[PDB]
Ligand binder design. Structure first.
Ligand SMILES: N[C@@H](CCCC[NH3+])C(=O)O
Lengths: 196, 197, 196, 196, 196, 197
């Protein structure tokens, strides 16, 4: 059984419990339910993020919400229904919203400053899509020295094209991108309840 | 049954760049991957494809930037040991700049942003190892600076990695997924190096 | 579309599967990577030989490694790095090494005795350089009544001079030398995986 | 400007004049005129062999003829016209004939004995076909320590197939095979008259 | 008193303070304490480099270290004691090290790229030996359009031979080589403290 | 009592090269040093010794490369005035190439590396002006390309230069120190031109 690079280098870390982490929810937006990027596993993932949000709000764990700012008439249009939060994952009680324009939630934003104000090294990162904004933000978090913990069940993606007319299933892309992050960028658990 | 890429959906897609109009970025073509602890199964096949790009770039005056990972003493990418050295067939020649890095992101704590800026080419052709770590991370980071990235699938390689429930993901399946991911929102992808000539 | 002499003589044979063959690897030495004969197609050909070696070791196929014995200060110097096996193609599991001093791997060597003891009439021949040690050794094998199989992609050569200060490209030399072997000395396939 | 291996090794040698050599004529047979292998350059090449044969007979240079013995109803059939020498390159009384069954004119024959008896280290090798019997016999001569000289114009060959329904022209085959022999097995000249 | 070429050409420049400069430390290595090149003035010069290093670290001035790679087991032993930094002048934090094999620390190195990345035209150059690696590196820096400042006290050299079995003292060589640099390649001060 | 050179200590020293085996490289033998603003006290003595090397080289078919400094209008080495011209006794003759340079390093922004490679001799004999600036810089640069340099002390000259605290370093003291420095790690040194004939 192959070891992770984290294990080989001695720089690995256990999955962080929610109660000692900052919860970072990435792009829980209506585009993934009724827009151009309807994710087949959205409801299952949103249910798992809700389990984390409920436990975090009950314990006073910090929650940061990332929203993608699309363009007029495009994906995640902020003037349109597709740009809004999924109703079940709206911010409450002044939980901060970070508006981003690139897959990297740190890039051109106040995210770094906000996570520093909370003072927790451990980030629990969840949301969409696993292979783009989530993976990119997790990879960028390593450069600042954060530990990232992900639950596989709390992120989701879609089918994407491969070379020569092929298709890569959402489930195969998810498995690969979660394994890649587990290799050198994060601690991975299967389910949200493992972090409670 | 045929999904679009985000680049296609956003209208921001771009053609694969010809090597002649690009800066060639080679990531971590080091001896660790041949005679170290991370012996990649597809190293030779991929190094051959990088060699095709290197040979063509040297003949055309195309800029080549070599990235070298600085690891820890006596171990992975040992800076004072054979495992840290470039593969002999992909050694830099005079004039070709080397960037030494410590993290997967070749931009992070390095002069890479500066060098690519001074070359003045928005198109990067990125190749090297490993596909899912330093390559993917560096390509994703290039998007934040406004670079266009082109990759040949055959010019990158990786290794088997563990999954949940004591599974293994094969190098081939990790490569397929990680290239497709970059094709969705971070790069133009071609099958083989000769398509960039 | 001209016929081969093997086809005209009715003496043609199918490409041998690796599982029924002795795998013969010619001069996979550092001369060709870091010495005076750096072959541009070395890595592509070493990758294809590696496919054959992995499959041979998985099935108990015998592997014979030929190593050119050069002179001090010269090509394939046995006391210098240039004489040693490429690491990814080195002998494992006590696979035998045959040292040779001429292009013909049989000349002044134990090669005939070793092949005879394996008791397999089918040889799969790969390595370097296509037009010199590989071609010569394949042609010599016909005198002993071996059948030879080659993959085009598992051999490589270099640019060589012609009359009037011309240069023959490695690709043109390879194409011609593989076609000449296919005419009267071997079964030819494009790629290593076709012998799996 | 690439060097030959003979030059890199310091083992090179100049073309031998005919007067210091043994002339070895390979398979100058009727098969190539009226049989199944009608070489497009037969007459031009047989003319150049003729130049060397005439010069040799006038100066008492030894000439050894090689004749391929095929099987009844096959290529080089000895039981009909296609096995016989071209009339213009027939042996004249005193000149010995080596009859062979393989491409290597040494294999199972008196050739080594005849060449040792003439006591000339230099062989001039000419005839048919360049890539098969000529190339194989020249390569085999190296193992005995002979120096070989060929004139490109006194050898000929035919179109042969390549992979995927391709064809290599006789001229391309001839060019590559003479260059391959020039790299490590022979000194090459363009024309017979250069050896006079 | 005679003018420098920098004054005559009006291309002169004042000594740069440490706060506006990149600090470049050349070959502060164990060779000069316990190897074949024991500089009589090493401790006094290393003390003055230490003043600059301490001040640069306290004020966020960038520091680049150059290390010379010599002979396995011998001069500037690359992975042995003699090749290591003097313990008091070891790199800290993310201070970059340039390894060189020539007196010119720019030649085939990343130095130009690292200095350009720091964005400061003014270099303070110190270390060993004044007349060889220091002088060569300062001269080379003129071709890239850098301005160099040297403190005489923060460089050292050794006695060297002249013609006729003569000896040039470290003190005379230092005076001459620092003045040569002042003439066309640098701004000179007596002591490290004048740059604080 | 007698210290060793760094070249002796490293085992990579070489003897002085005879003129007959060398390319002769003559640096900035120009009228500025005779009738301009930089009148060298030792110019005539040095020019006599360079003349000996030029005469022997011309006699024996030894290649000669002339380096000339290109100054600015109205400045030192003005190419538009007499001060930028060659000293009459050291003018180039038919087929001897001239390299025009803007910096002390004669290789920098010039075709000097190309010309020297075209003559195919590893041994340069370097002479001319000034010892401590263009000569010293050019000899130091030569090491980076793998050349061996030979100098005659008598075939170079410099001038008095200021030191710290209003002091003066004499032309002779500067010469002795800069020739010794080149002998330490950059060159084989002889006393006079006739030792190379
Ligand atoms: N006789 C071989 C020819 C291979 C040519 C490769 N250059 C075949 O039929 O496959």
């Amino acid at each position: 059984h192959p070891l992770t690079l984290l294990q080989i280098s001695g720089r690995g870390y256990p999955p962080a419990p929610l109660r000692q982490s900052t919860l970072l929810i990435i792009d829980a937006q209506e585009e993934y339910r009724s827009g151009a990027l309807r994710l087949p596993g959205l409801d299952a993932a949103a249910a798992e993020i809700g389990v984390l949000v409920q436990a975090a709000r009950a314990s006073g764990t910090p929650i940061v919400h990332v929203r993608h700012l699309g363009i007029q008439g495009g994906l995640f249009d902020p003037q349109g229904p597709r740009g809004q939060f999924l109703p079940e994952l709206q911010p409450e009680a002044g939980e901060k919203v970070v508006e981003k324009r690139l897959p990297n939630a740190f890039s051109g934003t106040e995210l770094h400053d906000l996570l520093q104000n909370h003072g927790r090294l451990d980030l629990i990162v969840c949301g969409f899509m696993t292979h783009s904004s989530v993976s990119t933000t997790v990879r960028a978090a390593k450069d600042y020295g954060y530990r990232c913990t992900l639950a596989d069940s709390a992120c989701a993606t879609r089918d994407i094209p491969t070379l020569n007319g092929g298709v890569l299933s959402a489930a195969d892309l998810q498995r690969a991108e979660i394994a890649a992050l587990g290799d050198n960028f994060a601690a991975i658990v299967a389910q949200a309840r493992e972090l409670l």
